[PDB]
Design an enzyme around this catalytic site. Structure first.
Site, PDB file in Angstrom:
ATOM      1  N   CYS A   5       0.777  -1.229  -0.324  1.00  0.00           N
ATOM      2  CA  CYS A   5      -0.064   0.016  -0.355  1.00  0.00           C
ATOM      3  C   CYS A   5       0.863   1.402   0.014  1.00  0.00           C
ATOM      4  N   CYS A  12      -2.284   1.304  -2.831  1.00  0.00           N
ATOM      5  CA  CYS A  12      -3.237   1.985  -2.052  1.00  0.00           C
ATOM      6  C   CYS A  12      -2.448   3.614  -2.904  1.00  0.00           C
ATOM      7  N   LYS A  30      -1.175   4.763  -6.237  1.00  0.00           N
ATOM      8  CA  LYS A  30      -2.035   4.357  -6.768  1.00  0.00           C
ATOM      9  C   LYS A  30      -3.139   6.168  -6.901  1.00  0.00           C
ATOM     10  N   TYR A  75      -9.193  -4.310 -10.827  1.00  0.00           N
ATOM     11  CA  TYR A  75      -9.429  -2.755 -10.702  1.00  0.00           C
ATOM     12  C   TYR A  75      -8.423  -2.076 -10.386  1.00  0.00           C
ATOM     13  N   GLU A 116      -7.256   1.235 -12.816  1.00  0.00           N
ATOM     14  CA  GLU A 116      -6.904   2.068 -12.295  1.00  0.00           C
ATOM     15  C   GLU A 116      -5.778   2.494 -12.955  1.00  0.00           C
ATOM     16  N   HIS A 122     -27.892  19.795  -0.025  1.00  0.00           N
ATOM     17  CA  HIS A 122     -27.537  20.516  -0.887  1.00  0.00           C
ATOM     18  C   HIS A 122     -26.943  21.618  -1.162  1.00  0.00           C
ATOM     19  N   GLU A 165     -26.897  13.818  -1.873  1.00  0.00           N
ATOM     20  CA  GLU A 165     -28.147  13.927  -1.297  1.00  0.00           C
ATOM     21  C   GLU A 165     -28.736  12.829  -2.568  1.00  0.00           C
TER      22      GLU A 165
HETATM   23  C1  LIG Z   1      -1.509  -1.604  -7.414  1.00  0.00           C
HETATM   24  C2  LIG Z   1      -1.729  -1.616  -6.389  1.00  0.00           C
HETATM   25  C3  LIG Z   1      -3.208  -0.613  -5.892  1.00  0.00           C
HETATM   26  C4  LIG Z   1      -4.048  -0.628  -4.242  1.00  0.00           C
HETATM   27  N1  LIG Z   1      -4.747   0.231  -4.422  1.00  0.00           N
HETATM   28  C5  LIG Z   1      -5.548   0.116  -3.012  1.00  0.00           C
HETATM   29  C6  LIG Z   1      -6.365   0.554  -2.511  1.00  0.00           C
HETATM   30  O1  LIG Z   1      -6.409   2.196  -2.722  1.00  0.00           O
HETATM   31  N2  LIG Z   1      -7.169   1.199  -1.162  1.00  0.00           N
HETATM   32  C7  LIG Z   1      -6.683  -0.111   0.096  1.00  0.00           C
HETATM   33  O2  LIG Z   1      -7.083  -0.240   0.290  1.00  0.00           O
HETATM   34  N3  LIG Z   1      -5.609  -1.728  -0.525  1.00  0.00           N
HETATM   35  C8  LIG Z   1      -5.192  -1.526  -1.891  1.00  0.00           C
HETATM   36  N4  LIG Z   1      -4.439  -2.096  -2.503  1.00  0.00           N
HETATM   37  C9  LIG Z   1      -3.775  -3.377  -1.501  1.00  0.00           C
HETATM   38  C10 LIG Z   1      -2.931  -3.398  -0.064  1.00  0.00           C
HETATM   39  O3  LIG Z   1      -2.338  -2.867  -0.661  1.00  0.00           O
HETATM   40  C11 LIG Z   1      -3.255  -4.571   0.788  1.00  0.00           C
HETATM   41  O4  LIG Z   1      -4.209  -5.028   0.288  1.00  0.00           O
HETATM   42  C12 LIG Z   1      -2.322  -4.720   1.651  1.00  0.00           C
HETATM   43  O5  LIG Z   1      -1.127  -4.019   1.464  1.00  0.00           O
HETATM   44  C13 LIG Z   1      -1.998  -5.731   2.190  1.00  0.00           C
HETATM   45  O6  LIG Z   1      -1.406  -5.540   3.898  1.00  0.00           O
HETATM   46  P1  LIG Z   1      -0.403  -7.086   4.144  1.00  0.00           P
HETATM   47  O7  LIG Z   1       0.036  -6.531   5.138  1.00  0.00           O
HETATM   48  O8  LIG Z   1      -1.322  -8.372   4.950  1.00  0.00           O
HETATM   49  O9  LIG Z   1       1.026  -6.948   3.221  1.00  0.00           O
HETATM   50  P2  LIG Z   1       1.939  -6.032   2.294  1.00  0.00           P
HETATM   51  O10 LIG Z   1       1.989  -4.680   2.180  1.00  0.00           O
HETATM   52  O11 LIG Z   1       2.085  -6.044   1.209  1.00  0.00           O
HETATM   53  O12 LIG Z   1       3.003  -6.631   3.137  1.00  0.00           O
HETATM   54  C14 LIG Z   1       3.806  -7.667   3.773  1.00  0.00           C
HETATM   55  C15 LIG Z   1       5.854  -7.245   3.763  1.00  0.00           C
HETATM   56  O13 LIG Z   1       6.246  -8.365   3.642  1.00  0.00           O
HETATM   57  C16 LIG Z   1       7.318  -8.404   2.979  1.00  0.00           C
HETATM   58  N5  LIG Z   1       7.201 -10.278   2.740  1.00  0.00           N
HETATM   59  C17 LIG Z   1       6.860 -11.244   1.814  1.00  0.00           C
HETATM   60  N6  LIG Z   1       8.080 -12.525   2.583  1.00  0.00           N
HETATM   61  C18 LIG Z   1       8.362 -12.106   3.097  1.00  0.00           C
HETATM   62  C19 LIG Z   1       9.017 -13.051   3.709  1.00  0.00           C
HETATM   63  N7  LIG Z   1       9.127 -14.520   3.585  1.00  0.00           N
HETATM   64  N8  LIG Z   1       9.884 -12.245   4.812  1.00  0.00           N
HETATM   65  C20 LIG Z   1      10.029 -11.118   4.607  1.00  0.00           C
HETATM   66  N9  LIG Z   1       9.427 -10.788   4.375  1.00  0.00           N
HETATM   67  C21 LIG Z   1       8.542 -10.632   3.453  1.00  0.00           C
HETATM   68  C22 LIG Z   1       6.635  -7.787   1.645  1.00  0.00           C
HETATM   69  O14 LIG Z   1       7.619  -7.533   1.009  1.00  0.00           O
HETATM   70  C23 LIG Z   1       5.942  -6.303   2.290  1.00  0.00           C
HETATM   71  O15 LIG Z   1       6.775  -5.223   2.794  1.00  0.00           O
HETATM   72  C24 LIG Z   1      -3.743  -2.149  -3.375  1.00  0.00           C
HETATM   73  C25 LIG Z   1      -2.879  -3.262  -3.848  1.00  0.00           C
HETATM   74  C26 LIG Z   1      -2.119  -3.209  -5.774  1.00  0.00           C
HETATM   75  C27 LIG Z   1      -1.126  -4.204  -5.884  1.00  0.00           C
HETATM   76  C1  LIG Z   2     -26.923  33.403  -0.992  1.00  0.00           C
HETATM   77  C2  LIG Z   2     -27.122  31.775   0.226  1.00  0.00           C
HETATM   78  C3  LIG Z   2     -27.232  31.499  -0.192  1.00  0.00           C
HETATM   79  C4  LIG Z   2     -27.929  30.159   0.301  1.00  0.00           C
HETATM   80  N1  LIG Z   2     -27.137  28.465   0.064  1.00  0.00           N
HETATM   81  C5  LIG Z   2     -27.940  26.789   0.336  1.00  0.00           C
HETATM   82  C6  LIG Z   2     -27.348  26.184   0.311  1.00  0.00           C
HETATM   83  O1  LIG Z   2     -25.860  25.771  -0.332  1.00  0.00           O
HETATM   84  N2  LIG Z   2     -28.498  24.693   0.413  1.00  0.00           N
HETATM   85  C7  LIG Z   2     -29.664  24.811   0.601  1.00  0.00           C
HETATM   86  O2  LIG Z   2     -30.280  23.812   1.124  1.00  0.00           O
HETATM   87  N3  LIG Z   2     -29.731  26.438   0.704  1.00  0.00           N
HETATM   88  C8  LIG Z   2     -29.267  27.245   1.017  1.00  0.00           C
HETATM   89  N4  LIG Z   2     -30.038  28.970   1.115  1.00  0.00           N
HETATM   90  C9  LIG Z   2     -31.060  28.699   1.579  1.00  0.00           C
HETATM   91  C10 LIG Z   2     -31.797  27.617   0.416  1.00  0.00           C
HETATM   92  O3  LIG Z   2     -32.377  28.762  -0.709  1.00  0.00           O
HETATM   93  C11 LIG Z   2     -33.469  28.487   1.475  1.00  0.00           C
HETATM   94  O4  LIG Z   2     -33.697  27.737   2.802  1.00  0.00           O
HETATM   95  C12 LIG Z   2     -34.407  28.099   0.598  1.00  0.00           C
HETATM   96  O5  LIG Z   2     -34.975  28.582  -1.040  1.00  0.00           O
HETATM   97  C13 LIG Z   2     -36.351  28.542   1.108  1.00  0.00           C
HETATM   98  O6  LIG Z   2     -37.351  27.302  -0.122  1.00  0.00           O
HETATM   99  P1  LIG Z   2     -39.046  28.611  -0.066  1.00  0.00           P
HETATM  100  O7  LIG Z   2     -39.661  27.940  -0.635  1.00  0.00           O
HETATM  101  O8  LIG Z   2     -39.447  28.711   1.606  1.00  0.00           O
HETATM  102  O9  LIG Z   2     -38.157  30.433  -0.142  1.00  0.00           O
HETATM  103  P2  LIG Z   2     -37.739  31.326  -1.531  1.00  0.00           P
HETATM  104  O10 LIG Z   2     -37.304  29.622  -2.431  1.00  0.00           O
HETATM  105  O11 LIG Z   2     -37.203  32.390  -1.114  1.00  0.00           O
HETATM  106  O12 LIG Z   2     -38.953  31.120  -2.403  1.00  0.00           O
HETATM  107  C14 LIG Z   2     -39.959  32.245  -2.504  1.00  0.00           C
HETATM  108  C15 LIG Z   2     -40.709  32.987  -3.788  1.00  0.00           C
HETATM  109  O13 LIG Z   2     -41.759  33.623  -3.193  1.00  0.00           O
HETATM  110  C16 LIG Z   2     -41.442  34.575  -3.762  1.00  0.00           C
HETATM  111  N5  LIG Z   2     -42.479  35.296  -3.154  1.00  0.00           N
HETATM  112  C17 LIG Z   2     -42.194  36.059  -2.199  1.00  0.00           C
HETATM  113  N6  LIG Z   2     -43.651  36.680  -1.830  1.00  0.00           N
HETATM  114  C18 LIG Z   2     -44.733  36.734  -2.845  1.00  0.00           C
HETATM  115  C19 LIG Z   2     -45.862  36.907  -2.414  1.00  0.00           C
HETATM  116  N7  LIG Z   2     -46.537  37.654  -1.686  1.00  0.00           N
HETATM  117  N8  LIG Z   2     -46.458  36.988  -3.161  1.00  0.00           N
HETATM  118  C20 LIG Z   2     -46.105  36.427  -5.108  1.00  0.00           C
HETATM  119  N9  LIG Z   2     -45.050  35.918  -4.620  1.00  0.00           N
HETATM  120  C21 LIG Z   2     -44.389  35.646  -3.385  1.00  0.00           C
HETATM  121  C22 LIG Z   2     -40.619  35.004  -4.634  1.00  0.00           C
HETATM  122  O14 LIG Z   2     -39.825  35.881  -4.898  1.00  0.00           O
HETATM  123  C23 LIG Z   2     -39.819  33.658  -4.428  1.00  0.00           C
HETATM  124  O15 LIG Z   2     -40.037  33.428  -5.671  1.00  0.00           O
HETATM  125  C24 LIG Z   2     -29.198  30.079   0.654  1.00  0.00           C
HETATM  126  C25 LIG Z   2     -29.297  30.662   0.989  1.00  0.00           C
HETATM  127  C26 LIG Z   2     -29.046  32.303   0.538  1.00  0.00           C
HETATM  128  C27 LIG Z   2     -29.081  33.585   0.305  1.00  0.00           C
END
Ligand SMILES: Cc1cc2nc3c(=O)[nH]c(=O)nc-3n(C[C@H](O)[C@H](O)[C@H](O)COP(=O)(O)OP(=O)(O)OC[C@H]3O[C@@H](n4cnc5c(N)ncnc54)[C@H](O)[C@@H]3O)c2cc1C
Ligand SMILES: Cc1cc2nc3c(=O)[nH]c(=O)nc-3n(C[C@H](O)[C@H](O)[C@H](O)COP(=O)(O)OP(=O)(O)OC[C@H]3O[C@@H](n4cnc5c(N)ncnc54)[C@H](O)[C@@H]3O)c2cc1C
Lengths: 482, 482
Positions: free
Chosen positions: B50, B55, B58, B192, B196, B461, B466
């Site tokens: 790894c 890991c 990669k 994989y 990858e 959102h 989500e």
């Molecule tokens: C290309 C690739 C990508 C991977 N990507 C991921 C990933 O994204 N996420 C993930 O969770 N896992 C990933 N894995 C798998 C992960 O690396 C292994 O599951 C993990 O390393 C296993 O751990 P281990 O301790 O059993 O053995 P290892 O980490 O393989 O260690 C064994 C060690 O013992 C040594 N050894 C062997 N025989 C002897 C001996 N007779 N005497 C002394 N020393 C010895 C070795 O040389 C080595 O240093 C990937 C593997 C590969 C090949």
């Molecule tokens: C800068 C900013 C960033 C935000 N970022 C996020 C975010 O990342 N994630 C998240 O979940 N929420 C976010 N929010 C909040 C989210 O937009 C509000 O919680 C959501 O829009 C509320 O929904 P609503 O239906 O109650 O009202 P609104 O969506 O405000 O709609 C009310 C509508 O009714 C109209 N209206 C008002 N009075 C009248 C009337 N008397 N007659 C007719 N029409 C009327 C309005 O003009 C409008 O079109 C953010 C808000 C702001 C200000």
């Protein structure tokens, strides 16, 4: 026109979902959606905030800035890209806006195909079963229905008593549509909207500054929010901690003269920026509804609509959904489902209620912050430090190693109950693809996953999410988290 | 030297974890690791496959190719990058290799700090409590211990009866260390490992071709594997379906003359490539152990080590871990934990056993494939088509829209039990950051999540994950999945 089985005020995230479902349940639905322009004069199509000035544009511009980091990293892996690479706002905006439009038309086509009369009219109640509306050319039109659903969401909020505020400032509504680069920008706010915007703005090379009155991301786990801003300022975003604006003066050069009080150092400084964006919270759109003329009580503080566990209100046949519904989380997915299920309950024969508990979320800042469940602080408030165990860890994305990009702030903490098997209360992830990572764990919490189960869950190597599963160091233990 | 409480043969993923834990449990541990070079003459440090040829390398080279796609997408979001961007293998290799080394030294430092005598000696049994080993300069050295753990993993496999095979071919072992670009390459295999490698090779601009005797990724859900290869050939990788190599002849130009049988068209074609990589499965390293001289039975077919539910074997004090243990999944995370827990059981006082059920995984191909739990086909085999419900969907990553990059193959299917609440048997994700997405859902399956719970789990959102939670269209329903 005549009446409909269902009438939905607001054609956005929540409303459109309710309508489409009701329409799919063989009911005659109607929806009215009007986009009252912004102070600066911005306006858009059908789809609500998320589609036009929220999630979509935001996420795509964030994707833009991210790509910029991707180009640097590119050279480290052998990609001989000419580093002096500029970025121009026009192309980006053009691209983002066109997609936004696909969604406008995408919705109209969906409303046409399910046959839902669309009235681009801004509603307002007259009685308990009827509404009145105006249009582009402004002309009334009688509309009524047995059931009514209010999904009018909200809109940005301007500061009170700040001269220059409206006259020159812009909001989240205006930024995603600017015709020309914002140039040097000042973001006033500490909400996620504020951070995300200054973030991608910094990402695309703009001189950006965030002005915060007090703490960041009030509401979210503070340690994580702290880590977020720290990452930002460590990577280009300038910060003005403990400051409030007092007035803006436009110079004969058209630049903006921002004057402010700095409650953490001197007592009043001034700066010059090309754009000033107010990201200081939104306000529910109820003003124009005349909710009084229909007898729909609303809570005083937050002018939202008081609602039942069935998104119902004062009147039994009038329901509220989304940003207008009090208590409900201001997210697009919740509004969508809430409204969809509401349709299912009305004329679908379902008895299932919307469940707003443990809703995962993700703030898309330079370094993404995804979370679900209880805040650490939130957890001790409900159980007491005494019965909460917190596991945490600083990790380093494999991809960050060869790109040689700072891993600080890449922190992960999992809040669990202290008593075994130790049910998980909340999970917090800070790093690449945070929303991608958090999602799955949300299912874990909805199912009641336990830390015991987390330990028996093998990780996918190599990835960032596996770190979530490898967590073993508690905060109580006092041990080093790296 | 003298004896130790614990002796581990093989200093890789599994072994190093077992040793470090045992060493942390106050026991005197020793580990012997020798890297018998590859036919082509490649060799490396401590850490196993790894770290050196798995890991890590990669994943990082995959990250390289990915960045290439990122640069194209870059221009769509407004990044004026000079498109004619070359990539050179030397830089990449240099970068990847240096990191690989950090891990070599990183391990030695960890073995030094926990005090574990390291004998770079290739072991082989002499009796039931002692081993004999050779070194760089080849000189015996007596080593014994009460408990012994075999973690020797495996190694690539060369084809039998293929002239030119060894003399000119290379393996997964050689590729991550090549001094000069592989130039035009032919990957022979359908594992994989095969996919990858041809994948990132294609990604970095090399003319790559995969030669497959039959089906792709035998063992994995076939529909998904199908989708994977389809994505690959649609994006640069050339495929030679139904073909087998018969001989390789080196030309006076040093190129390779690959001759082969094409069981799907004619009957024998030939090609010319710069490199030929054999990715046709690995073989457990037991040959050199003289397992017979210690009385450790092994299964005939796969020369693995037969083992207990406690990774034990013929002898009660000799245990096998990792790629050598029969039945055990060839993954790094399982070997790590298995060995770690084994240490916990021996001198830690724990009674917990390793749980290899529902282990998530992810093949890092151009378009990533992450999965956990049962294969669809695998599910009907254990329950019958009659009692299985499969939900699926084709989706489009927000980021793909502005970059205008093909979303085909971005498919998601979730295999559940048909009877409510419909327990989830397996989840399959194909798209960006697949491992990042799948992880969390693994916790969902380890907890017994249900489709009912999936429906009550709101999404983040906007994100790809989500979609996993928005799934509603079953295959039985016959409805369009897009
Ligand atoms: C290309 C690739 C990508 C991977 N990507 C991921 C990933 O994204 N996420 C993930 O969770 N896992 C990933 N894995 C798998 C992960 O690396 C292994 O599951 C993990 O390393 C296993 O751990 P281990 O301790 O059993 O053995 P290892 O980490 O393989 O260690 C064994 C060690 O013992 C040594 N050894 C062997 N025989 C002897 C001996 N007779 N005497 C002394 N020393 C010895 C070795 O040389 C080595 O240093 C990937 C593997 C590969 C090949
Ligand atoms: C800068 C900013 C960033 C935000 N970022 C996020 C975010 O990342 N994630 C998240 O979940 N929420 C976010 N929010 C909040 C989210 O937009 C509000 O919680 C959501 O829009 C509320 O929904 P609503 O239906 O109650 O009202 P609104 O969506 O405000 O709609 C009310 C509508 O009714 C109209 N209206 C008002 N009075 C009248 C009337 N008397 N007659 C007719 N029409 C009327 C309005 O003009 C409008 O079109 C953010 C808000 C702001 C200000």
């Amino acid at each position: 026109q005549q009446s409909f089985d269902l009438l939905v005020i607001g054609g956005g995230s929540g409303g459109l979902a309710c309508a489409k479902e009701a329409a799919q349940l063989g009911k005659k639905v109607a929806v009215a959606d009007y986009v009252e322009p912004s102070p600066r004069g911005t306006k858009w199509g059908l789809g609500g905030t998320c589609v036009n000035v929220g999630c979509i544009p935001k996420k795509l511009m964030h994707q833009a800035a991210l790509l910029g980091g991707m180009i640097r990293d590119a050279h480290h892996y052998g990609w001989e890209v000419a580093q002096p690479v500029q970025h121009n706002w026009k192309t980006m905006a053009e691209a983002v806006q066109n997609h936004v439009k696909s969604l406008n038309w995408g919705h109209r086509v969906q409303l046409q195909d399910r046959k839902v009369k669309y009235f681009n009219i801004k509603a307002s109640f007259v009685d308990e079963h009827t509404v009145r509306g105006v249009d582009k050319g402004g002309k009334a039109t009688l509309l009524s229905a047995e059931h009514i659903v209010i999904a009018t969401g909200g809109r940005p909020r301007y500061p009170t008593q700040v001269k220059g505020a409206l006259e020159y400032g812009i909001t989240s509504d205006d930024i995603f549509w600017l015709k020309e680069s914002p140039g040097k920008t000042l973001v006033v706010g500490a909400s996620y909207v504020a951070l995300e915007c200054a973030g991608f703005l910094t990402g695309i090379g703009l001189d950006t500054t965030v002005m915060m009155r007090s703490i960041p991301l009030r509401g979210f786990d503070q340690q994580m929010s702290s880590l977020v801003t720290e990452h930002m300022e460590s990577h280009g975003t300038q910060f003005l901690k403990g400051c409030v604006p007092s007035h803006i003066k436009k110079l004969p050069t058209n630049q903006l003269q921002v004057t402010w009080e700095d409650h953490a150092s001197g007592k009043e400084d001034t700066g010059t920026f090309d754009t000033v964006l107010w990201a200081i919270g939104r306000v529910p759109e109820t003003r124009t509804l005349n909710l009084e003329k229909a007898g729909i009580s609303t809570n005083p503080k937050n002018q939202k609509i008081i609602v039942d566990a069935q998104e119902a209100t004062s009147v039994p046949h009038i329901y509220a959904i989304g940003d207008v519904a009090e208590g409900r989380p201001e997210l697009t997915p919740t509004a969508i489902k809430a409204g969809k299920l509401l349709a299912q309950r009305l004329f679908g024969k379902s008895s299932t209620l919307m469940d707003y508990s443990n809703v995962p979320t993700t703030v898309f800042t330079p370094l993404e912050y995804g979370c679900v469940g209880l805040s650490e602080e939130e957890a001790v408030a409900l159980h007491g430090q005494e019965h909460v165990e917190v596991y945490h860890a600083y990790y380093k994305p494999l991809e960050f190693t060869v790109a040689d990009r700072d891993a600080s702030q890449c922190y992960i903490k999992m809040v669990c109950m202290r008593e075994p098997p130790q049910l998980v209360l909340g999970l917090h992830f800070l790093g690449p693809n945070a929303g991608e990572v958090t999602q799955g764990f949300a299912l874990g919490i909805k199912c009641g996953a336990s830390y015991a189960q987390v330990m028996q869950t093998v990780g996918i190597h190599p990835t960032c999410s596996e770190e979530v599963v490898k967590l073993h160091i508690s905060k109580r233990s006092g041990l080093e988290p790296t």
